[PDB]
Amino acid sequence: NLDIIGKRIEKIKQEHETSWHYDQDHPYKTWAYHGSYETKSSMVNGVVRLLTKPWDIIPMVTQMAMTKEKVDTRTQEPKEGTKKLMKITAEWLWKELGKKKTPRMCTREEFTRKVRSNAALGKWKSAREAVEDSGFWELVDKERNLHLEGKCETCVYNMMAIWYMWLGARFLEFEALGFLNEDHWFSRENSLSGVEGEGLHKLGYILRDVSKKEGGAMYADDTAGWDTRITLEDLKNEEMVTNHMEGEHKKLAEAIFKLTYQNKVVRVQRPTTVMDIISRRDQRGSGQVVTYGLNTFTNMEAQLIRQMEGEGVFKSIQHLTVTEEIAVKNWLVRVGRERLSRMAISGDDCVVKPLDDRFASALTALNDMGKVRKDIQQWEPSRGWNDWTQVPFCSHHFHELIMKDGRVLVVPCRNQDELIGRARISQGAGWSLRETACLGKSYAQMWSLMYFHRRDLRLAANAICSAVPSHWVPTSRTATHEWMTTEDMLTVWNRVWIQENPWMEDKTPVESWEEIPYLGKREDQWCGSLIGLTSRATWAKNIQTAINQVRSLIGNEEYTDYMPSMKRFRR
Ligand SMILES: CN(C[C@H]1CCOC1)c1ncncc1Cl
Ligand SMILES: [Zn+2]
Ligand SMILES: [Zn+2]
């Protein structure tokens, strides 16, 4: 414990020896308190807002732009029967994920490029500058050699609930564990339940394939605060990925797991403004990308065990008999792969089509692993879905949409207020008119690619692309983002929905936007369309005037009129 975290703790004190204090009114019960010292929002995208005027009076849109507790909780230790189930399943799952993959270290050369290309990776101002400074790498080397020693000095978390770390520590995590993401361990092809790198244009088709299997309802239970419910028992089954490694990699990964994952150290600001230094062994404390993969892994494990429980593979979680152990092992070997194919899992989010509806009341292992369901009483059976087009997954639902030529699109969808409200927000300071416009164009092209079937979004997308210089490149400060390009959007649509779509047998390209269908007028309204409203009609008829207002603000640039791509706006 204190041997592992002390050096980190001791070092911080020294740098604040003048302002150190062991305050006795510290709000922590579950976290460990060590000492303190002295220290001390969303903007609106005007391009998108000026081109979505009817939404200026919709509170669901406008409120999205205005504006820890659950981190201080503790999950009890699972029973010995649960721990056995988890260890057997995790051992078998790492082996399956490893069959066609080789663990390997990621490199400085890999890390530098990602940073020189902008990406989330929690002396030098920007991190781009540090990656160019040898001094930094001298620091990294120092820490690396310390990790090989089984010790840690500078790998400390900063709460705000995302925990940032110094770039060097992010590198050491990426060096040891980046392979999980960089080499697509949680791809569908590889992991069977996973959907990493799939894209929102494929999730619908994947849920439809799971629906084709014989079984009961589709279950999509959320977990209440998943990250907070990760047990030390979970952080150790995740560690068993090191079993598949060798050489320096195994030691570096064992150190990431041992030191920065199974014994965290965090500096939290408390206005009461001091910087508390607290610690704890459990919960999820890693980079957002390694968090995704280890969330997917532990979720896959939990859902296979809930499936085992519904099939009566084991009678009770209190203790596993020797014959039960063998029975669990034989199940995994005989049907594990089939059972993984019955699930779509994205980090803490899942959809399971079990063998039958006994799964709905198989709750003892799930509750005892601490994966308590959100908004339903602990022992109340899960509500299942009878139609794959109603199932929630990754903040979306999916429609089946028949083109005028008979070909079948499976399209992603969500409440339109949520889509418009997110596009009206830009996170960052010092944004020029030009980069605000290019962010608006990134939303517009995403809408043309993913949400073309929504009347308001195809119209607003065409208006924004008409209002922003044709050659300005779409930007995003931080899945498959095919909308991030200056290529013609009809050409990308044909590539994503027809040519590269493995569920479309006939590869006949689409020649214009009017060949591409919409949802039913009533379905469109149900998912939040303003069609029918006087406000939306004035907006559509006078769109050229809104486009011209934004063109006048940006100035005398080369624009294209994309409005005649629609039927109505043709002369
Ligand atoms: C006004 N209507 C039809 C009515 C009847 C049911 O929905 C509203 C439109 N329908 C489709 N696209 C654009 C428009 Cl505005
Ligand atoms: Zn360290
Ligand atoms: Zn919908």
Side-chain angles (χ1 to χ4, degrees), residues 1-66 68-571:
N1 174 21
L2 256 172
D3 51 328
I4 292 178
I5 59 174
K7 187 173 181 69
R8 270 174 281 178
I9 295 175
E10 288 155 33
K11 170 168 189 299
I12 300 182
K13 176 178 175 181
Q14 297 167 3
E15 297 139 357
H16 309 287
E17 193 78 17
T18 304
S19 304
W20 189 261
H21 39 283
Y22 181 98
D23 156 36
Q24 291 247 317
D25 292 335
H26 64 246
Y28 311 97
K29 197 70 198 279
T30 64
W31 287 82
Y33 179 77
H34 298 283
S36 294
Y37 67 80
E38 186 156 280
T39 51
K40 271 171 291 165
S41 74
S42 85
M43 319 299 282
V44 179
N45 186 320
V47 168
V48 175
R49 174 157 71 179
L50 278 180
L51 296 170
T52 56
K53 187 182 215 213
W55 289 273
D56 289 357
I57 62 165
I58 304 299
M60 292 301 308
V61 167
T62 59
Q63 311 266 38
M64 291 187 45
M66 315 294 299
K68 186 173 177 174
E69 173 304 287
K70 174 150 208 165
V71 63
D72 232 316
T73 53
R74 203 216 63 160
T75 296
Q76 182 177 24
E77 193 181 24
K79 310 320 194 191
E80 308 308 315
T82 314
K83 300 202 279 209
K84 198 55 48 169
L85 284 165
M86 287 195 302
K87 225 99 200 165
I88 291 165
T89 311
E91 168 181 43
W92 172 91
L93 187 54
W94 282 135
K95 277 205 194 57
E96 286 299 306
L97 292 181
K99 282 192 192 167
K100 310 178 303 151
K101 298 282 190 211
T102 302
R104 51 93 181 180
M105 301 194 325
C106 294
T107 62
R108 300 190 175 185
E109 288 61 40
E110 262 179 308
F111 188 67
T112 301
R113 186 152 51 94
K114 305 178 61 60
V115 316
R116 293 224 276 258
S117 55
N118 272 9
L121 288 169
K123 214 301 177 181
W124 327 270
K125 168 224 311 171
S126 54
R128 195 161 302 185
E129 299 179 352
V131 94
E132 305 156 348
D133 186 335
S134 308
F136 172 88
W137 299 114
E138 308 145 0
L139 303 180
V140 174
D141 276 330
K142 187 177 173 175
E143 255 284 306
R144 187 163 166 184
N145 282 308
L146 281 170
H147 286 172
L148 296 161
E149 232 163 295
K151 310 174 185 171
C152 184
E153 196 185 293
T154 78
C155 308
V156 172
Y157 284 115
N158 303 24
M159 195 168 290
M160 265 136 88
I162 314 72
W163 303 346
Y164 298 81
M165 251 182 172
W166 82 292
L167 198 64
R170 258 57 186 92
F171 173 76
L172 286 183
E173 171 189 79
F174 169 78
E175 175 174 27
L177 301 175
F179 71 91
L180 288 169
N181 181 247
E182 289 304 305
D183 303 345
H184 305 322
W185 276 53
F186 297 105
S187 54
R188 197 154 190 84
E189 166 180 326
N190 195 49
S191 74
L192 305 187
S193 315
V195 292
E196 187 279 330
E198 291 304 322
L200 197 57
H201 50 106
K202 317 242 295 187
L203 295 192
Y205 284 110
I206 289 169
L207 288 189
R208 189 182 67 178
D209 278 349
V210 173
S211 87
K212 272 170 182 184
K213 301 216 161 222
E214 295 279 297
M218 294 187 87
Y219 296 80
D221 301 337
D222 300 358
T223 292
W226 174 275
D227 298 320
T228 65
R229 309 280 174 151
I230 286 290
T231 67
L232 177 51
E233 227 53 46
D234 288 322
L235 282 181
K236 278 200 166 184
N237 294 319
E238 283 154 34
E239 196 257 10
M240 301 194 338
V241 66
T242 57
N243 278 349
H244 300 258
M245 303 181 188
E246 69 184 22
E248 185 176 356
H249 186 205
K250 183 180 178 69
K251 300 305 172 178
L252 291 174
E254 285 169 346
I256 292 311
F257 274 113
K258 252 200 170 96
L259 309 173
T260 69
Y261 284 13
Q262 288 191 35
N263 297 288
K264 319 172 191 41
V265 161
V266 199
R267 48 173 56 181
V268 182
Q269 258 193 6
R270 190 150 55 98
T272 67
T273 282
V274 326
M275 190 75 73
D276 292 314
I277 291 314
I278 48 163
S279 75
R280 92 173 299 125
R281 301 211 48 213
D282 76 344
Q283 307 199 346
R284 180 67 74 206
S286 323
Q288 78 181 40
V289 173
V290 168
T291 294
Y292 180 80
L294 295 182
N295 285 347
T296 307
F297 176 86
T298 301
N299 208 0
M300 283 170 70
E301 178 203 295
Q303 306 300 321
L304 272 174
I305 292 166
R306 184 172 173 185
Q307 288 198 72
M308 273 171 220
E309 183 166 353
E311 287 184 46
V313 173
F314 69 92
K315 188 181 160 290
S316 151
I317 61 160
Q318 220 78 29
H319 148 85
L320 218 62
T321 78
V322 286
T323 65
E324 267 176 333
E325 284 201 25
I326 151 269
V328 166
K329 288 169 204 206
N330 254 331
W331 187 87
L332 281 171
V333 160
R334 159 180 95 262
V335 297
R337 287 180 69 81
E338 193 282 345
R339 302 290 194 268
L340 287 178
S341 74
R342 291 182 164 268
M343 301 180 297
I345 306 202
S346 194
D348 67 340
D349 207 8
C350 66
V351 173
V352 185
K353 189 167 192 190
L355 210 61
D356 50 66
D357 295 311
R358 292 174 286 175
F359 184 94
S361 36
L363 298 172
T364 66
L366 184 74
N367 281 323
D368 191 45
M369 294 179 294
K371 306 308 181 303
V372 162
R373 293 163 306 154
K374 201 183 47 161
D375 293 343
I376 187 160
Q377 301 158 315
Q378 212 188 223
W379 298 108
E380 194 64 32
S382 291
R383 303 186 176 92
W385 305 85
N386 308 124
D387 171 15
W388 67 264
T389 72
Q390 314 264 243
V391 176
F393 189 47
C394 299
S395 294
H396 287 74
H397 57 277
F398 303 83
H399 298 256
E400 229 182 29
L401 175 59
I402 306 159
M403 295 174 83
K404 286 175 278 157
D405 57 45
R407 297 187 288 183
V408 184
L409 299 171
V410 178
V411 295
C413 193
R414 56 194 285 188
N415 183 264
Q416 189 184 263
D417 292 343
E418 297 177 12
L419 294 179
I420 292 179
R422 313 162 81 73
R424 287 160 66 122
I425 292 178
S426 45
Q427 323 282 17
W431 283 65
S432 70
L433 184 41
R434 172 160 182 153
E435 48 213 12
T436 301
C438 292
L439 184 57
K441 182 166 178 169
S442 307
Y443 278 103
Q445 296 193 157
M446 173 182 82
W447 290 348
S448 315
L449 213 45
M450 299 297 87
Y451 306 123
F452 46 88
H453 52 89
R454 304 311 303 286
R455 288 167 178 79
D456 296 348
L457 292 196
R458 194 188 299 194
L459 195 153
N462 287 323
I464 292 157
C465 293
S466 290
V468 183
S470 58
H471 299 100
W472 286 8
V473 183
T475 71
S476 160
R477 287 197 177 183
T478 46
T480 80
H481 294 224
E482 288 84 347
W483 56 88
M484 297 303 294
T485 172
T486 48
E487 197 169 16
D488 172 39
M489 284 296 102
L490 184 61
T491 299
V492 180
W493 190 102
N494 277 301
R495 179 187 307 135
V496 169
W497 289 105
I498 310 293
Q499 174 185 154
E500 299 186 339
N501 176 353
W503 290 277
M504 194 74 77
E505 193 162 341
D506 165 8
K507 301 298 196 177
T508 301
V510 152
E511 289 301 335
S512 71
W513 281 102
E514 280 175 39
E515 281 204 72
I516 297 165
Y518 299 98
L519 299 176
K521 276 151 43 194
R522 185 181 312 284
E523 304 185 286
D524 209 346
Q525 280 191 337
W526 286 343
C527 294
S529 181
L530 293 198
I531 58 177
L533 298 190
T534 293
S535 60
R536 194 277 192 187
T538 309
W539 170 68
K541 191 179 192 305
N542 306 329
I543 196 61
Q544 300 299 343
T545 304
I547 289 174
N548 287 335
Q549 179 185 24
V550 167
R551 286 177 169 171
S552 310
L553 287 170
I554 294 173
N556 187 21
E557 297 285 345
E558 178 189 352
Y559 304 97
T560 316
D561 179 27
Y562 295 103
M563 307 319 295
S565 70
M566 312 198 94
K567 185 174 86 286
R568 64 173 288 164
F569 292 118
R570 300 192 301 181
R571 182 180 171 82

